[PDB]
Design an enzyme around this catalytic site. Structure first.
Site, PDB file in Angstrom:
ATOM      1  N   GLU A  38     -51.070  32.243 -42.044  1.00 40.50           N
ATOM      2  CA  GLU A  38     -50.942  33.697 -42.143  1.00 40.50           C
ATOM      3  C   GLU A  38     -50.031  34.047 -43.322  1.00 40.50           C
ATOM      4  OE1 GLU A  38     -47.863  35.443 -40.448  1.00 40.50           O
ATOM      5  OE2 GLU A  38     -48.573  37.488 -40.336  1.00 40.50           O
TER       6      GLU A  38
ATOM      7  N   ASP B 148     -50.073  42.335 -34.839  1.00 43.61           N
ATOM      8  CA  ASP B 148     -49.092  42.932 -35.734  1.00 43.61           C
ATOM      9  C   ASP B 148     -49.526  44.263 -36.336  1.00 43.61           C
ATOM     10  OD1 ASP B 148     -47.364  40.715 -35.471  1.00 43.61           O
ATOM     11  OD2 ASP B 148     -48.314  39.648 -37.130  1.00 43.61           O
TER      12      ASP B 148
ATOM     13  N   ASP C 200     -47.856  30.158 -38.876  1.00 42.53           N
ATOM     14  CA  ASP C 200     -47.185  31.449 -39.003  1.00 42.53           C
ATOM     15  C   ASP C 200     -46.337  31.591 -40.259  1.00 42.53           C
ATOM     16  OD1 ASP C 200     -46.286  33.961 -37.682  1.00 42.53           O
ATOM     17  OD2 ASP C 200     -44.324  32.988 -37.841  1.00 42.53           O
TER      18      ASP C 200
HETATM   19  O1  LIG Z   1     -38.492  39.017 -34.226  1.00 43.33           O
HETATM   20  C1  LIG Z   1     -39.430  39.351 -35.245  1.00 43.33           C
HETATM   21  C2  LIG Z   1     -40.863  39.455 -34.764  1.00 43.33           C
HETATM   22  O2  LIG Z   1     -41.262  38.125 -34.371  1.00 43.33           O
HETATM   23  C3  LIG Z   1     -42.646  38.047 -34.112  1.00 43.33           C
HETATM   24  O3  LIG Z   1     -43.361  38.503 -35.247  1.00 43.33           O
HETATM   25  C4  LIG Z   1     -44.120  37.528 -35.941  1.00 43.33           C
HETATM   26  C5  LIG Z   1     -45.536  38.012 -36.170  1.00 43.33           C
HETATM   27  O4  LIG Z   1     -46.170  38.308 -34.937  1.00 43.33           O
HETATM   28  C6  LIG Z   1     -46.263  36.882 -36.932  1.00 43.33           C
HETATM   29  O5  LIG Z   1     -47.629  37.199 -36.979  1.00 43.33           O
HETATM   30  C7  LIG Z   1     -45.574  36.758 -38.283  1.00 43.33           C
HETATM   31  O6  LIG Z   1     -45.699  37.986 -38.923  1.00 43.33           O
HETATM   32  O7  LIG Z   1     -44.223  36.426 -38.138  1.00 43.33           O
HETATM   33  C8  LIG Z   1     -43.401  37.109 -37.220  1.00 43.33           C
HETATM   34  C9  LIG Z   1     -42.255  36.124 -36.936  1.00 43.33           C
HETATM   35  O8  LIG Z   1     -42.734  34.887 -36.430  1.00 43.33           O
HETATM   36  C10 LIG Z   1     -43.039  38.964 -32.942  1.00 43.33           C
HETATM   37  O9  LIG Z   1     -44.444  38.933 -32.737  1.00 43.33           O
HETATM   38  C11 LIG Z   1     -42.562  40.397 -33.225  1.00 43.33           C
HETATM   39  O10 LIG Z   1     -42.774  41.143 -32.026  1.00 43.33           O
HETATM   40  C12 LIG Z   1     -41.050  40.338 -33.524  1.00 43.33           C
HETATM   41  O11 LIG Z   1     -40.602  41.657 -33.869  1.00 43.33           O
HETATM   42  O1  LIG Z   2     -43.068  44.885 -40.351  1.00 40.85           O
HETATM   43  C1  LIG Z   2     -43.001  43.517 -39.971  1.00 40.85           C
HETATM   44  C2  LIG Z   2     -43.590  42.624 -41.044  1.00 40.85           C
HETATM   45  O2  LIG Z   2     -42.551  42.419 -42.009  1.00 40.85           O
HETATM   46  C3  LIG Z   2     -42.949  41.632 -43.100  1.00 40.85           C
HETATM   47  O3  LIG Z   2     -43.903  42.304 -43.888  1.00 40.85           O
HETATM   48  C4  LIG Z   2     -43.482  42.766 -45.174  1.00 40.85           C
HETATM   49  C5  LIG Z   2     -44.489  42.170 -46.164  1.00 40.85           C
HETATM   50  O4  LIG Z   2     -44.322  40.767 -46.172  1.00 40.85           O
HETATM   51  C6  LIG Z   2     -44.220  42.778 -47.547  1.00 40.85           C
HETATM   52  O5  LIG Z   2     -45.242  42.306 -48.400  1.00 40.85           O
HETATM   53  C7  LIG Z   2     -44.338  44.312 -47.443  1.00 40.85           C
HETATM   54  O6  LIG Z   2     -44.077  44.841 -48.703  1.00 40.85           O
HETATM   55  O7  LIG Z   2     -43.330  44.772 -46.544  1.00 40.85           O
HETATM   56  C8  LIG Z   2     -43.580  44.295 -45.225  1.00 40.85           C
HETATM   57  C9  LIG Z   2     -42.687  45.046 -44.263  1.00 40.85           C
HETATM   58  O8  LIG Z   2     -41.312  44.997 -44.596  1.00 40.85           O
HETATM   59  C10 LIG Z   2     -43.464  40.272 -42.649  1.00 40.85           C
HETATM   60  O9  LIG Z   2     -43.924  39.473 -43.703  1.00 40.85           O
HETATM   61  C11 LIG Z   2     -44.586  40.414 -41.626  1.00 40.85           C
HETATM   62  O10 LIG Z   2     -44.909  39.112 -41.169  1.00 40.85           O
HETATM   63  C12 LIG Z   2     -44.060  41.280 -40.489  1.00 40.85           C
HETATM   64  O11 LIG Z   2     -45.090  41.519 -39.533  1.00 40.85           O
END
Ligand SMILES: OC[C@H]1O[C@H](O[C@H]2[C@H](O)[C@@H](O)[C@@H](O)O[C@@H]2CO)[C@H](O)[C@@H](O)[C@@H]1O
Ligand SMILES: OC[C@H]1O[C@H](O[C@H]2[C@H](O)[C@@H](O)[C@H](O)O[C@@H]2CO)[C@H](O)[C@@H](O)[C@@H]1O
Ligand SMILES: OC[C@H]1O[C@H](O[C@H]2[C@H](O)[C@@H](O)[C@@H](O)O[C@@H]2CO)[C@H](O)[C@@H](O)[C@@H]1O
Ligand SMILES: OC[C@H]1O[C@H](O[C@H]2[C@H](O)[C@@H](O)[C@@H](O)O[C@@H]2CO)[C@H](O)[C@@H](O)[C@@H]1O
Ligand SMILES: [Ca+2]
Ligand SMILES: [Ca+2]
Ligand SMILES: [Ca+2]
Length: 686
Positions: free
Chosen positions: A256, A329, A228
Site C-alpha cells: 500500500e 481508510d 502496509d
Molecule cells: O494510529 C494511526 C492509524 O493506524 C491505522 O491506520 C493505518 C491504515 O489503516 C493503513 O491502511 C495505513 O495507511 O497505515 C496506517 C498505519 O498502519 C488505523 O487503521 C487507523 O485507524 C489509525 O488512526
Molecule cells: O489521514 C491519514 C493518512 O495519513 C497519511 O496520508 C498522507 C499522504 O501520505 C500524503 O501524500 C498526503 O499529502 O497527506 C496525507 C494526509 O496527511 C498516510 O500516508 C496514510 O496512510 C493515512 O491513512
C-alpha cells in the site's frame, strides 16, 4: 503454484474484528482485558469478529466469487487502551510480530482458517505492518505500552529503553507528510493524540525479526501479503524482504503506497517502486478517478479512460495493480453516493478492468459509513440474493474463465461524459464492456466497433444491471439503446492454437526460485521454457500453467518464452537478482552544492544498481535513488543489493535541467554485508 498470480481472482478485504464473531470466548481475554465492547457502540473498541468467524463464512465467500481473502493484520496488537475507548481492534498497532492477536485466535486458529480456505479454492493474503509497533507519547512512558515490542512473548524493547539497541527511529513526528525523509524516518501520527513507534528497518535485529515474522506467515500457509505503509519505510527493505519471501514460495505481494497520484511530486517514486521493488501496488491512481466518476460525479468517463491510459503507460506490470472503489481508510462508496446502480457500475468496472479487484467487506450487503472508524461497521448480513452479490459472483466467474479479463489489453470503443464502452483482448479472447453511469438517461449507441467475432451476443449478466444483447458483423456492432444506469457485458473465448503467456510471477527472484507461467495453449505434453534463451527446469506443465525453477544464469531483466509443439510464445520479462539480498544504507559525504530540483543518484556494476545507467525514469534496473539529504551536504538512501558481494559504484548529480555530473576519479569499491542490513559510507570524489 496458484499463489503467484491473482489475475483471475476477486480479492475480498476483511477487517477481522468487524466481520463475524465465530468464537465468543476470545472476546475479552485476560491478557488484554477491558478492550471489548459488547454493545457495538464504541467504534474504536474490539467488537469481537475473529479468524474462526471468517472460517465459518467460507461458503458465503465462495458463493460470492471470492478467490483471495485479504485479512486485516493478524498479529498481536497493543494489550492496553491508547486513550479513551481506543484500541488496536484494526490490527495496525503490533506489539509482537510472532504471535496471533489473542482476540482473533491462535496459530492453530490461523492454520485452520488457511487450510479450510485452501480446501475451498480460496487463497489468503495477510496485511503485514512493518513500519511501527504501537502508540506512544514521547513525554510519558506510561501511556499505552510505550511502543513495546516482543519476540514471541520475550520482551525486546520500547521507545524509552532503546539507547543501546536502536530498534526504533528517534527523529520526532512527521510534520510534512509529502517530505520523503520525514515520511520514512519520522513518526506516523494519529489525530487522537499519539504517535506510533517507528521501527528501524536499518537495524539488523529488527530487519531480520520482521523478515522472520513475514516468513512465518508464509510457512503457515499464507499465499502472500498486503504490505502496509510502504511509503513510510525505506524501499531497499521492501525489495530485500520480497527477495526472502520469493525464496520461500511463489507468493503474491502488493504494497500500500498511499496516494501520490499522477502529477504529484512523489508519483514517479511510487511508479519506480512498483516497477522495481518486486512488490506490486494498490491502485490509488485509478481509485481517485473511480470515486469522482461514479461517486461524486465531478469527473467524467473521459477522465476515467485517461487514467486507464496513463497508468497503462507507467506501470510495467499494470495487470498486477490491485484496484478498489473504497477501503478501510476512506468513506464507503454508498456514503459518497447512495445510488446502488452507481455502486454496481463501479464494481463492474473493477471486476472487468486490468489488474485484480479488491472488494471491501460488506460492499455487496450495501454497507454505508463515513471515514474511519465509521467505514468499519459490523458486517450486517450474509444475504446471497442481493443484486451486488449476484453481480460479483457472475463477473468473478467471467474473470476466472476469460483470459482477456486476466491479461488483456484495454481499448476504448465508445465514450462520452456518461458512457464508457471498453474492450479487453488477449489474443482470440475478447470481452466488450459497456457502462452508462447516468441513471436517468438512456443513450443510442451507434458506430461501435469491436474485435468480437461475428454473431449475436447475450449480456453475460442476463440483464441484471439493465444490459441488452448485441449483434456483431465484421467488427461492427448494430446500433442499440444502452439503458439508464446500465452495465452490459459481451464476451467470446476459445482454445488457443499456440502458446500464449498471460503472466510470469513473481517478477523478481534468484536462481532456483519457483516461478509460475500462466496462460493458454501450452498443451498437455511438456515442451520447453527459456529465460533469455537459457533452458529452465520444469517443475510442472499443464495447458494453462507451467511451474519452472529460475535457471542458474547471469543476473538482470530477461525474457521468458514458452515453446510448445515447436512454436514459441510471446515474451514476458522477469528480473533475476545477483543473489540473496541485503538492505544497505549508502551514504555519500560532502557532495558538491546543489540547487532545488537537483538530486543525487547511485549507479554501479550490477543490475541492482543499474549497470551504470544514468536513467532515472520508471524503467527497471536503472539509476538508483534519489538519495535524500537531511544531513546536507551528505546524502543517503537505502538500497537492496546482493549480500556478501564485492561491488563497484559511483554517485552522480542529476541537475534540475537533466544535466548529469558524475563523481570524478575511480569507482568506489566495497563488499556488501552478509546479514539482513549494513552500511556503506564513502566521500564524494571531487
Ligand atoms: O494510529 C494511526 C492509524 O493506524 C491505522 O491506520 C493505518 C491504515 O489503516 C493503513 O491502511 C495505513 O495507511 O497505515 C496506517 C498505519 O498502519 C488505523 O487503521 C487507523 O485507524 C489509525 O488512526
Ligand atoms: O489521514 C491519514 C493518512 O495519513 C497519511 O496520508 C498522507 C499522504 O501520505 C500524503 O501524500 C498526503 O499529502 O497527506 C496525507 C494526509 O496527511 C498516510 O500516508 C496514510 O496512510 C493515512 O491513512
Ligand atoms: O465509429 C468509430 C468511432 O467509435 C467511437 O466514437 C464514438 C464516440 O466515442 C461517441 O461519443 C459518439 O460520438 O459516437 C462515436 C461513433 O460514431 C470511438 O470512441 C472512436 O474512437 C471511433 O473512431
Ligand atoms: O558506462 C560504463 C562506465 O560507467 C562509469 O564511467 C563513468 C565515469 O565514472 C565518469 O567519470 C564519466 O567518465 O562517465 C563515465 C560513463 O560514460 C564507470 O565509472 C565505469 O567503470 C563504467 O565502465
Ligand atoms: Ca470473538
Ligand atoms: Ca493483543
Ligand atoms: Ca518509518
Amino acid at each position: 503454484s496458484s499463489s503467484a498470480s491473482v489475475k483471475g481472482d476477486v480479492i475480498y478485504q476483511i477487517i477481522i474484528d468487524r466481520f463475524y464473531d465465530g468464537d465468543t470466548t476470545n472476546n475479552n481475554p485476560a491478557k488484554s482485558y477491558g478492550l471489548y465492547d459488547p454493545t457495538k457502540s464504541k467504534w474504536k473498541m474490539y467488537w469481537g469478529g475473529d479468524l474462526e468467524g471468517v472460517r465459518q463464512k467460507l461458503p458465503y465467500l465462495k458463493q460470492l466469487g471470492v478467490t483471495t481473502i485479504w485479512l486485516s493484520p493478524v498479529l498481536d496488537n497493543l494489550d492496553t487502551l491508547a486513550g479513551t475507548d481506543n484500541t488496536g481492534y484494526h490490527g495496525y498497532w503490533t506489539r509482537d510480530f510472532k504471535q496471533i492477536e489473542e482476540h482473533f485466535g491462535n496459530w492453530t486458529t490461523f492454520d485452520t482458517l488457511v487450510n479450510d480456505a485452501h480446501q475451498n479454492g480460496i487463497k489468503v493474503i495477510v496485511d503485514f505492518v512493518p513500519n511501527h509497533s504501537t502508540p506512544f507519547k514521547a513525554n510519558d512512558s506510561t501511556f499505552a505500552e510505550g511502543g513495546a515490542l516482543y519476540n514471541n512473548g520475550t520482551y525486546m524493547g520500547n521507545y524509552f529503553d532503546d539507547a543501546t539497541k536502536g530498534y526504533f527511529h528517534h527523529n520526532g513526528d512527521i510534520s510534512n507528510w509529502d517530505d520523503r525523509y520525514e515520511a520514512q524516518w519520522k513518526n506516523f501520527t494519529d489525530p487522537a493524540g499519539f504517535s506510533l513507534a517507528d521501527l528501524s528497518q536499518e537495524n539488523g535485529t529488527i530487519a531480520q525479526y520482521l523478515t522472520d515474522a513475514a516468513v512465518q506467515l508464509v510457512a503457515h500457509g499464507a499465499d502472500g501479503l498486503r504490505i502496509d505503509a510502504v511509503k513510510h519505510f525505506n524501499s531497499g527493505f521492501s525489495k530485500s524482504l520480497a527477495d526472502k519471501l520469493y525464496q520461500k514460495k511463489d507468493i503474491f505481494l502488493v504494497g500500500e503506497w498511499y496516494g501520490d497520484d499522477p502529477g504529484t511530486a512523489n508519483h514517479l517514486e511510487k511508479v519506480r517502486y512498483a516497477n522495481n521493488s518486486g512488490v506490486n501496488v494498490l491502485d490509488f491512481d485509478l481509485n481517485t478517478v473511480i470515486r469522482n466518476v461514479f461517486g461524486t460525479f465531478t469527473q467524467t468517463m473521459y477522465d476515467l479512460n485517461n487514467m486507464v491510459n496513463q497508468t497503462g503507460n507507467e506501470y510495467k506490470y499494470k495487470e498486477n495493480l490491485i484496484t478498489f472503489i473504497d477501503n478501510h481508510d476512506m468513506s464507503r462508496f454508498l456514503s459518497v453516493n447512495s445510488n446502488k446502480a452507481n455502486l454496481h457500475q463501479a464494481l463492474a468496472f473493477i471486476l472487468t478492468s486490468r489488474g485484480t479487484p479488491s472488494i471491501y467487506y460488506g460492499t455487496e450487503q450495501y454497507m454505508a459509513g463515513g471515514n474511519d472508524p465509521y467505514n468499519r461497521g459490523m458486517m450486517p448480513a450474509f444475504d446471497t440474493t442481493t443484486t451486488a452479490f449476484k453481480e460479483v459472483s457472475t463477473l468473478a466467474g467471467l474473470r476466472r474463465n476469460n483470459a482477456a479479463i486476466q491479461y488483456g489489453t484495454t481499448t476504448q470503443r465508445w465514450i462520452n461524459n456518461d458512457v464508457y464502452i471498453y474492450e479487453r483482448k488477449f489474443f482470440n479472447d475478447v470481452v466488450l464492456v459497456a457502462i452508462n453511469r447516468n441513471t436517468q438517461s438512456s443513450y443510442s449507441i451507434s458506430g461501435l466497433q469491436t474485435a468480437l467475432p461475428n454473431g449475436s451476443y447475450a449480456d453475460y449478466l442476463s440483464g441484471l444491471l439493465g444490459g441488452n444483447g448485441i449483434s456483431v458483423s465484421n467488427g461492427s456492432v448494430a446500433s442499440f439503446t444502452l439503458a439508464p444506469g446500465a452495465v452490459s457485458v459481451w464476451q467470446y473465448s476459445t482454445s488457443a492454437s499456440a502458446p500464449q503467456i498471460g503472466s510470469v510471477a513473481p517478477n523478481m527472484g534468484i536462481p532456483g526460485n519457483v516461478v509460475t507461467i500462466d496462460g493458454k495453449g501450452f498443451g498437455t505434453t511438456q515442451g520447453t521454457v527459456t529465460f533469455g534463451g537459457v533452458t529452465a527446469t520444469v517443475k510442472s506443465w499443464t495447458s494453462n500453467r507451467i511451474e519452472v525453477y529460475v535457471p542458474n544464469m547471469a543476473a538482470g531483466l530477461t525474457d521468458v518464452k514458452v515453446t510448445a509443439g515447436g512454436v514459441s510464445s510471446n515474451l514476458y520479462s522477469y528480473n533475476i537478482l545477483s543473489g540473496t539480498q541485503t538492505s544497505v544504507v549508502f551514504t555519500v559525504k560532502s557532495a558538491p552544492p546543489t540547487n532545488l530540483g537537483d538530486k543525487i543518484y547511485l549507479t554501479g556494476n550490477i543490475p541492482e544498481l543499474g549497470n551504470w545507467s544514468t536513467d532515472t525514469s520508471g524503467a527497471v534496473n536503472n539509476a538508483q535513488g534519489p538519495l535524500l539529504a537531511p544531513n546536507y551536504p551528505d546524502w543517503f538512501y537505502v538500497f537492496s543489493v546482493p549480500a556478501g558481494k564485492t561491488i563497484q559504484f559511483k554517485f552522480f548529480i542529476k541537475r534540475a535541467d537533466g544535466t548529469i555530473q558524475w563523481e570524478n576519479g575511480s569507482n568506489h569499491v566495497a563488499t556488501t554485508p552478509t546479514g539482513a542490513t549494513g552500511n556503506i559510507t564513502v566521500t564524494w570524489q571531487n
